[PDB]
Amino acid sequence: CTCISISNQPVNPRSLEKLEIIPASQFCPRVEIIATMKKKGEKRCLNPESKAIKNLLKAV
Amino acid sequence: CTCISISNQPVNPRSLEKLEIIPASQFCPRVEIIATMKKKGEKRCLNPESKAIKN
């Protein structure tokens, strides 16, 4: 997997440049949500189980 | 904007490598959704205004 850790902090959708969802595969046993922030092109994994994340996708 | 065409044809979840969601910006007025498949170098821009795409 690419995520060494995942953040539980809410992401401001206005600061989000891109969000990539990577389905659970053979290379990685869990779904990974990677957010690319506008700020400084900083990547950050989000919690696919968190509620703050479940909604984030809904909004978009 | 990178999606000049958007598809209404559902993607086989098994063939999906990843899905990218790009919210609207000052460079592109709409949200763009792109699925990258596992083979054939295939990518597909999906209709965000499609409930099916949310399936």
Curated annotation (Swiss-Prot), chain A:
Name which cysteines form disulfide bonds. Answer: 1-28, 3-45
This chain's protein is named CXCL10(1-73)
